Amino acid sequence: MSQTLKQLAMAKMAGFRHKTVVVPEWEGVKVVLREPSGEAWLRWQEVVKHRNLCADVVLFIDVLCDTDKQPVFSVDEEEQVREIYGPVHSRLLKQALDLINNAD
Amino acid sequence: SQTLKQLAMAKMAGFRHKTVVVPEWEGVKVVLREPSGEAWLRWQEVVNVSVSEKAHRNLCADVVLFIDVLCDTDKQPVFSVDEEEQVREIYGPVHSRLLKQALDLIN
Amino acid sequence: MSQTLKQLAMAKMAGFRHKTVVVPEWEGVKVVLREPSGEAWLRWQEVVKHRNLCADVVLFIDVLCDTDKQPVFSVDEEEQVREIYGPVHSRLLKQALDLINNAD
Amino acid sequence: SQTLKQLAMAKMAGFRHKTVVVPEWEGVKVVLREPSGEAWLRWQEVVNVSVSEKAHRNLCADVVLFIDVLCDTDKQPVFSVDEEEQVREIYGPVHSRLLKQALDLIN
Amino acid sequence: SQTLKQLAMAKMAGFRHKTVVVPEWEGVKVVLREPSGEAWLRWQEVVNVSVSEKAHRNLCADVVLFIDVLCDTDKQPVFSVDEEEQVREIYGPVHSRLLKQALDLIN
Amino acid sequence: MSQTLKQLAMAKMAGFRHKTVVVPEWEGVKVVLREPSGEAWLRWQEVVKHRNLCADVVLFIDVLCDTDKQPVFSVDEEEQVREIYGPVHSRLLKQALDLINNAD
Amino acid sequence: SQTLKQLAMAKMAGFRHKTVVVPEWEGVKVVLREPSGEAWLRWQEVVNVSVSEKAHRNLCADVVLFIDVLCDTDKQPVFSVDEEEQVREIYGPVHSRLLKQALDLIN
Amino acid sequence: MSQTLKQLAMAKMAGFRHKTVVVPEWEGVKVVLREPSGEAWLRWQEVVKHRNLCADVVLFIDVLCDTDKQPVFSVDEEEQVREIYGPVHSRLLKQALDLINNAD
């Protein structure tokens, strides 16, 4: 009962905020953005501890999704995203981080 | 007369609190209490910064308040202070909506 | 004469400010609040030097009174008040401290 | 002429001051003087803080000014600087009302 | 579908950019890109001061952004970070007008 | 010529600003205030290097004058002024220091 | 042409300046120049404080500017930097009125 | 091609901003002011590392020009300009530095 509540409170769930935006730098293509997972945030921390950006690359690959709400890049494609990642990608990451239901 | 000392000394006499049903956790009832001063303590202790560093630490701070506000129906803590990091990896939309509801009690 | 004045100025007197407030968290119960005594402030200092709150608990037990203007808790009940003491008690202590005729 | 040097050099020439009857100390008269600059000194020397820490130090600061303003009718100090702590344990409503009356002289 | 991953991963997908003809460099075309966050980094890292010290460091900061914005038509850097000092001695009106044009892309 | 100008520029002259004020703490008595001399300021420095006030006492004895524009106290009376000197004297010293033709 | 280099290089080309008669120094003429940047330097280098400490340091600062502004008719300094302290003991109403007149040139 | 572009981008060019101002301290004489060269800024740095002004003297000699847009002083005349250089010269240097097309 208190054990079932804790397990309920401890379960991985998803149900994340999603947002559809278009990107004029990419011929007006439509993109779906979501909040980063707890798992992505654990990997970002691992990078953080050009190193802030290796780090933001991992957040970015977790947030950037197609119209089917699936990530466009996989975690194995980090190094390749790392070499092309610029302000256009980080302006997309800023908008995905804004989706976080922050308290205050 | 015992009326006042008994209200003053009751379990959770120190806290505004309420019973909330949580639809997404199978209809289970929890008790939400306002945060203690020992938790509002850490919250402003947690809170040039990168944008993701700003969001990460707000998340960390949010989970600390969360752990403190969330109680079972016997008005007992679900999580100790010590499992902040455990809670941080699963914290999502429900937890954060329960935090807000709890912070509504101070308003 | 100057010795009698000093003794007059040195005497313990009371005559404290009292305030009646109701507390909605406690079924609307009526409470009397007073300024803390010099004696309470000496014990608070002893605690201060979770330790700020062991300390505020002693102030609180000195300020919180019944309709007969007598403290509801005794100094021996510190540890028990310590375990239930939360924001509702400290919002009552803030209002009791406000009663202090501060200069300025 | 001696008129000015004599006013300038008189006991308590340095201080605005008055005679006050104190009803609650058996009708005794005291003399209240504005604080010295050596006392306003300590007052802003005394003055994230907890609420009770804020009130405690204001009390400490108030007693320091009090000890300095309060004189007998022969325009002598009742308390030395050295018995601040002694005065702090008995300081209450009368002392604090006498402090205010003394600070009125600067206004 | 490959449409989005291919736009997202293209050379200079990370940067607003344009082709500019430069009349004073014999009609040559260059590519101007907005600065990277690793360059806006140094720019506010570079930026009582004498008037000439104020102008000198703005010049230093300007050349750092310049080196970062200026690309050839194959979308390759003309200058590395390492030749800042080399560029600083020849930096003049054209370079500074090309910097401005590049900073226009963020606007 | 340049030697006579320097000597002219180096001469002790006086010609100080004077101000007449009355003092209600002293039965409305009339007082003349003047800027402190360079000589007073040299003695004040000597004290400065309750010590700020031993110091301001010397300034005060130089500024506080009678209707004949002569100092009421002499430099030998420092210690006696020292024991009675309070806020009423220093409010008079503040007004005398205000007379200084400060640049800016 | 030599017109400009000759104006640019003349004695006191660097300074606004004027001839002033000083009635109280026997009608002698002096030359007042605006302060050098090496003197405005020290002036803000000189400038909780007691009231007399505030006035003393303004006096010190004033004498430093004074020594710098005051010249003879051959456009030579009357006092060196090194005799600040000598000037400080005699500085009074005339010197301070000559300082003001000199600072008027910048206005 | 990329080698010719770099060489194009690396060439010393001039084309500086010029401004005509008159100077009332110098009988209303007309002066031409220009941005300092990269070469002047290299010499200024050498001085910087009364030393700030030896330094600004070099900038000033590079900026101050005649109606023919040629510098009035030569770099060999530094020490002589050094002895007469005052606020009138540095107010001219401030206006020449303002001509710099600063970004922001």
- CB-neighbour burial class of residue B62 (10 A; exposed 0-12, middle 13-18, buried 19+): buried
What sign does the CA torsion over D80, D85, D86, D92 have?
positive
In chain E, domain spans:
1-107
- Smallest CA–CA distance from H15 into chain E, residue: E93
Decide if C18 contacts C6 (C-beta within 8 A).
no
DSSP states of G9-53: HSTTTTS-EEEEEEGGGTTEEEEEEPPPHHHHHHHHHH----HHH
Decide if G32 contacts G101 (C-beta within 8 A).
yes
Sheet with H64-65, side-by-side order of all strands: H18-23, H29-34, H64-65
Residue B21 host element (H or E): strand B17-22
Q: Do B16 and C26 touch (CB under 8 A)?
A: no
Tokens linked to H56: 């600004």
By C-alpha distance, which of D4, A24, B3 is closest to F32?
D4
> Using CA atoms, how far apart are residues G22 and G28, in angstroms rounded to an integer?
6
CB neighbourhood size of B19 (10 A) = 10
What Å distances lie between residue B88 and A41, B57, C56, H17, CA to CA? 9, 11, 32, 59
By C-alpha distance, which of A42, E77, A54 is closest to B91?
A42
What Å distances lie between residue F87 and D39, D75, D100, G53, CA to CA? 11, 16, 18, 17
DSSP states of G81-94: GGGHHHHHTT--HH
What Å distances lie between residue E33 and A19, A82, E82, F95, CA to CA? 27, 18, 19, 65
Q: Do F25 and D13 touch (CB under 8 A)?
A: yes
What Å distances lie between residue E12 and A44, A63, D71, E15, E27, CA to CA? 24, 20, 83, 5, 23
> Using CA atoms, how far apart are residues A91 and C11, in angstroms rounded to an integer?
71
Helices marked H in H1-104: 2-10, 38-48, 51-63, 78-84, 87-97
- Quickly tell me which residue has 């933001």 as its tokens: A56
Do C and E touch, counting CB pairs below 8 Å (3 needed)?
Answer: no
Decide if H53 contacts H24 (C-beta within 8 A).
no
E-strand ranges in F35-93 read 64-65
E-strand ranges in chain C read 18-23, 29-34, 64-65
- Rounded to a whole number of angstroms, the distance from the CA of G105 to the nearest CA of chain F is 14
Residue H102 host element (H or E): none
By C-alpha distance, which of E42, E89, D55, F84 is closest to C56?
D55
Residue F55 host element (H or E): helix F51-63
Best to test chain G binding among H20, H21, H23, H25 (most G CBs inside 10 Å): H25
For the segment(s) E1-107, the CATH number from 3.40.50.1220, 3.40.630.30, 3.30.2220.20, 3.90.550.10 is: 3.30.2220.20
What residues of G are in contact with residue F13 (Cβ under 8 Å)? 24, 90, 92-94
> Using CA atoms, how far apart are residues G80 and G67, in angstroms rounded to an integer?
7
The residues, any chain, with a CB within 8 Å of residue A75's CB and separated by 6 or more, are A43, A58, A61
Q: Do H87 and G14 touch (CB under 8 A)?
A: yes
Q: List the end-to-end C-alpha distance of chain H, in Å, as a whole number.
A: 32
DSSP states of D45-99: HH----HHHHHHHHHHHHHHHHHHHEE-TTS-BSS-GGGHHHHHTT--HHHHHHH
Among G3, G11, G34, whose Cβ lies nearest the Cβ of H87?
Answer: G34
Decide if domain C2-104 falls under CATH 3.30.830.10.
no
> Using CA atoms, how far apart are residues G69 and G66, in angstroms rounded to an integer?
5
- CB-neighbour burial class of residue E49 (10 A; exposed 0-12, middle 13-18, buried 19+): exposed
Q: Compute the residue count for chain H.
A: 104
> Using CA atoms, how far apart are residues A20 and A30, in angstroms rounded to an integer?
7
Decide if E16 contacts A89 (C-beta within 8 A).
no
CA G98 to chain centre: 8
Decide if D78 contacts C2 (C-beta within 8 A).
yes
> Using CA atoms, how far apart are residues G92 and F8, in angstroms rounded to an integer?
13
CA-derived radius of gyration, chain B: 15
> Using CA atoms, how far apart are residues G26 and B59, in angstroms rounded to an integer?
80
Among H29, H81, H87, whose Cβ lies nearest the Cβ of G4?
Answer: H29
The residues, any chain, with a CB within 8 Å of residue A20's CB and separated by 6 or more, are A30, A31, A32, A33, A67
C neighbour chains, 3+ CB pairs within 8 Å: B, D
SS (H, E, C) chain A: CHHHHHHHHHCCCCCCCEEEEEEHHHCCEEEEEECCCHHHHHHHHHHHCCHHHHHHHHHHHHHEECCCCCECCCHHHHHHHHHHCCHHHHHHHHHHHCCCCCCC
Decide if G7 contacts G19 (C-beta within 8 A).
no
CB neighbourhood size of A69 (10 A) = 12
Among B55, B65, B76, whose Cβ lies nearest the Cβ of A100?
Answer: B55
Decide if E69 contacts E41 (C-beta within 8 A).
no
> Using CA atoms, how far apart are residues G63 and F103, in angstroms rounded to an integer?
10
Q: Do A73 and E16 touch (CB under 8 A)?
A: no
> Using CA atoms, how far apart are residues D74 and F40, in angstroms rounded to an integer?
34
- Rounded to a whole number of angstroms, the distance from the CA of A86 to the nearest CA of chain E is 4
Q: Say yes or no: B2 contacts chain C, CB-CB below 8 A.
A: no
Decide if E84 contacts E67 (C-beta within 8 A).
yes
> Using CA atoms, how far apart are residues F81 and F61, in angstroms rounded to an integer?
8
Q: What is the resolution of this structure in A?
A: 2.3
| Phi/psi of residue E50, nearest 5 degrees | -75, 160
What Å distances lie between residue A16 and A7, A13, A69, CA to CA? 20, 9, 11
- Quickly tell me which residue has 């559809």 as its tokens: A20
**DSSP label at residue C75:** G
**Elucidation method:** X-ray
Q: Say yes or no: H72 contacts chain G, CB-CB below 8 A.
A: yes
> Using CA atoms, how far apart are residues H103 and D25, in angstroms rounded to an integer?
75
Decide if A20 contacts A30 (C-beta within 8 A).
yes
By C-alpha distance, which of G65, G63, G102 is closest to G86?
G63
CA E79 to chain centre: 10
By C-alpha distance, which of E58, E66, E6 is closest to E36?
E66
> Using CA atoms, how far apart are residues B9 and A92, in angstroms rounded to an integer?
52
Residue H71 host element (H or E): none
* Residue type at A68 in one-letter notation: D
Decide if F61 contacts F77 (C-beta within 8 A).
yes
Q: Say yes or no: H60 contacts chain G, CB-CB below 8 A.
A: no
Q: Compute the residue count for chain D.
A: 107
CA D97 to chain centre: 11
Q: List the end-to-end C-alpha distance of chain E, in Å, as a whole number.
A: 32
